[PDB]
Ligand SMILES: NC(=O)c1ccc[n+]([C@@H]2O[C@H](COP(=O)([O-])OP(=O)(O)OC[C@H]3O[C@@H](n4cnc5c(N)ncnc54)[C@H](O)[C@@H]3O)[C@@H](O)[C@H]2O)c1
Ligand SMILES: NC(=O)c1ccc[n+]([C@@H]2O[C@H](COP(=O)([O-])OP(=O)(O)OC[C@H]3O[C@@H](n4cnc5c(N)ncnc54)[C@H](O)[C@@H]3O)[C@@H](O)[C@H]2O)c1
Ligand SMILES: O=C(O)[C@H]1O[C@H](OP(=O)(O)OP(=O)(O)OC[C@H]2O[C@@H](n3ccc(=O)[nH]c3=O)[C@H](O)[C@@H]2O)[C@H](O)[C@@H](O)[C@@H]1O
């Protein structure tokens with residue numbers, strides 16, 4: 060069948076559409092923003108909360124649900140919109156998927172469902188989100204699993220908890236994008252806290268490969284899987300690496316930590332290896348170079 | 359300080375207000391419905407999503423957050439309102455509690471966050487709700503805990519997962535209330551499925567005692583605690599018990615199971631015993647008699 064991608068104009072979604080089409084799949088792309096300029100492509104422009112979702116899902120066997128408001132920090136002060144985009148739209152989409160007979164829905168969830176854990180975050184750990192954004196992504200994934208559990212549903216859900224994704228095309232509000240502009244263009248970036256916080260930074264090419272594997276693995280019911288590298292790097296170390304790669308001093312200013320940001324993320328990578336055969340291939344130094352090079356050419 | 363109860367006009371809230379006042383506490387009651395006809399009582403009428411919550415919280419040290427849309431089954435088809443009442447209102451209340459310097463917030467959560475588990479449901483089990491209602495109660499409790507975790511918050515949260523509460527005043531959409539009307543008044547009740555589903559039915563007097571203990575225990579940070587009996591009884595057994603107690607045949611009709619209802623709940627009761635000194639005192643046969651007697655007098 061054909062594949063539908065929500066959030067297809069965004070950072071991860073646009074890369075996914077490209078790979079799905081390259082692999083021969085007919086893609087239906089849904090987003091309220093325009094798509095950037097072998098399988099066919101139909102662009103459906105509109106809001107998940109306004110579109111006739113059942114109509115959008117005709118002949119669709121697999122849905123990749125990537126649409127969301129994704130920023131951790133604005134979620135404290137924009138909560139109605141985060142609920143509307145991240146939770147209500149998910150419920151409407153899942154109901155439409157039951158009605159349209161979709162077979163598989165892969166939902167983008169987030170490492171922010173774990174909250175503030177030291178060391179390795181495993182899919183059997185209790186979610187303890189520290190931001191309203193993390194709560195909305197937890198609610199979206201739990202809702203998707205509740206729909207898959209209905210006795211009238213013939214669908215399975217793959218809930219993929221991605222870890223801080225970067226690379227060519229990264230959303231411009233994320234740290235690595237801002238730091239690259241602070242280096243190549245001298246546009247200052249604020250470091251929120253002392254920079255010792257850590258992230259498991261995962262390159263978008265590995266995330267898209269994991270998504271493709273969920274489009275293809277044999278059906279074994281629903282699953283919750285971390286998609287990350289298992290290696291965490293500090294903000295200060297990313298700054299140093301960027302200075303080294305470019306021979307330009309990043310324009311940084313240290314400022315106050317932002318409530319809701321967790322101190323460290325690190326994925327347990329074992330379940331995705333077992334279930335999908337997925338292990339991330341790109342480490343940060345290689346990946347950071349890819350993003351710097353893409354950004355240069357983009358400017 | 360004074361105590362504020364949201365949802366104070368409802369089933370559990372009205373009993374809580376009575377006990378708080380009887381114990382000498384000044385109570386501020388908030389609900390969008392009118393309250394039923396030693397500590398003082400101020401009735402604040404309005405919607406949590408419209409009121410000036412900081413103003414409502416002046417001089418309030420402890421908040422009991424019981425307002426919600428509580429029905430499991432309508433949540434599939436009323437999801438915007440469940441989000442608005444159960445999640446958005448919770449976020450607004452918690453932000454107001456941080457701004458007003460409230461010290462302790464006790465949040466009514468629900469056994470429906472566990473989903474469909476056999477045997478004993480423990481606070482260390484991963485939540486896997488099977489209804490959109492369960493997702494909204496999970497989101498409300500997780501949000502409350504995220505606010506308590508903020509570095510600027512001087513507040514602790516007690517998230518109490520109640521198990522199927524009954525007794526005098528029970529909401530009329532719940533099974534025991536409907537079954538009592540089907541017995542005392544012959545108004546037929548539909549049994550949803552074959553009646554072999556089980557619940558841990560907890561009497562409201564025990565729930566109010568657990569709530570009072572959370573108003574009083576020494577502060578040891580935030581906690582998630584089941585409030586139940588640890589004994590589950592089937593729907594068919596409740597029917598038989600009601601027939602026995604009354605000498606009237608309940609007017610029942612078996613119908614189709616309702617998607618989203620879990621097959622069994624049973625609380626693990628240990629953590630509330632450890633943390634609060636709470637063990638439920640009322641078993642179902644005694645409690646069912648209390649509710650039947652109250653309903654007779656109420657008719
Ligand atoms: N980027 C990361 O580091 C990361 C990590 C974990 C999870 N995620 C999750 O992955 C997904 C994709 O993230 P991204 O970085 O590509 O974000 P993005 O903002 O680039 O893409 C999301 C897209 O969703 C669209 N959208 C939002 N609300 C919509 C609505 N109501 N109707 C129609 N379209 C709507 C947006 O226009 C946007 O193009 C999100 O669900 C996000 O929560 C991202
Ligand atoms: N009754 C049970 O078996 C049970 C079990 C587990 C959890 N709970 C939870 O306990 C709490 C109380 O349950 P209950 O059975 O007493 O329900 P209830 O419906 O009797 O009381 C809830 C009250 O909240 C009010 N309310 C709802 N939305 C409001 C809003 N936006 N603003 C102001 N008031 C609002 C309602 O008018 C109502 O009086 C709920 O949070 C419920 O989810 C109940
Ligand atoms: O893993 C995840 O699930 C989340 O990863 C990222 O969230 P975040 O960790 O906030 O990513 P960045 O915005 O790139 O921030 C990374 C680190 O840099 C810090 N930061 C960010 C931005 C900035 O301008 N300055 C700065 O110091 C942040 O405090 C944080 O510690 C994505 O933005 C979320 O969409 C995603 O859900």
Ligand SMILES: O=C(O)[C@H]1O[C@H](OP(=O)(O)OP(=O)(O)OC[C@H]2O[C@@H](n3ccc(=O)[nH]c3=O)[C@H](O)[C@@H]2O)[C@H](O)[C@@H](O)[C@@H]1O
Nearest residue numbers: 428430468469470520521522532533534548549550555619
């Ligand atoms: O424990 C909880 O957290 C939940 O307990 C109850 O939810 P529920 O289990 O649905 O309670 P009832 O409505 O009293 O239903 C109990 C059983 O009776 C069945 N039932 C209910 C109503 C009815 O008319 N017929 C009927 O057979 C239900 O299928 C269910 O198995 C409360 O209604 C929720 O507010 C609460 O959050």
